[PDB]
């Protein structure tokens, strides 16, 4: 429940 994790492909 963390909104600042990398939201893009290939993190």
């Amino acid at each position: 429940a963390n909104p600042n994790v990398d939201p893009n492909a290939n993190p």
Partner: antibody
Amino acid sequence: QVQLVESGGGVVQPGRSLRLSCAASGFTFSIYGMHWVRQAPGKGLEWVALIWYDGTNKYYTDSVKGRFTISRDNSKNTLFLQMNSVRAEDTAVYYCARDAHYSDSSGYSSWGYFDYWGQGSLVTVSS
Amino acid sequence: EIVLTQSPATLSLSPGERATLSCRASQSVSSYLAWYQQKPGQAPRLLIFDASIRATGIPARFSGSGSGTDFTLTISSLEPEDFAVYYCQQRSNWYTFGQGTKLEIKR
């Protein structure tokens, strides 16, 4: 060649619904997280919502949680914001923005910034 | 929430001059800070991210510095396309923006 073209704004009466569209071109839409950020007239920028590249995770600012829904259709390169139960204070220019995914020479990744933006779609909520 | 406070509210300068803009965070954001430029009627434009990294296509006269709670955007020689409102933004904890500094044309 990155382009984000918004549509769907206009005048909506309070309590009604409105759907914003953000059509992407010139980049691989389906590998980027996407955001909505809004700017009330004469005010600053307020982050609204985020959706992961694959549509799995979605996050919202508290004042829209339970009323706005973010979604995407990667097959149509389009990002959506469904705005339900709108309030006067939702009046703003709404921007879609790409999550800025950056990788340095040694492979370290950065994200969480807004590197390309739509032109803005004005939503006026008024009776 | 992390509150970003920008100063001064308005900077009145002439082309060629160095512009120094400050952004203060209510608590540490490490280096998770960005600067934007916005002109009337237009979308914001990313200038600097991770506190000091210049975005692609941004002129070298823009530079960012700082860490923790105190950040600075410097324009080494202001040019006419630089008169605009500047915002800082953090991504350490959710996403918040400063209230903006207007860089206006002195006369």
